[PDB]
Amino acid sequence: NKRWTQNVKFLKENIKSMIGDSLLASAFVSYIGAFSAKLRLELWKNTWL
Report the C-alpha gap between 4 and 40 in whole angstroms.
40
**What sign does the dihedral 28-34-37-39 (CA atoms) show?**
negative
Please report, as a single letter, which amino acid is at residue 18. M
Q: Coil, strand, or helix at residue 49?
A: coil
Q: CB under 8 Å to 41, separation ≥6 — which residues?
A: none
Q: Coil, strand, or helix at residue 36?
A: coil
Report the C-alpha gap between 11 and 5 in whole angstroms.
10
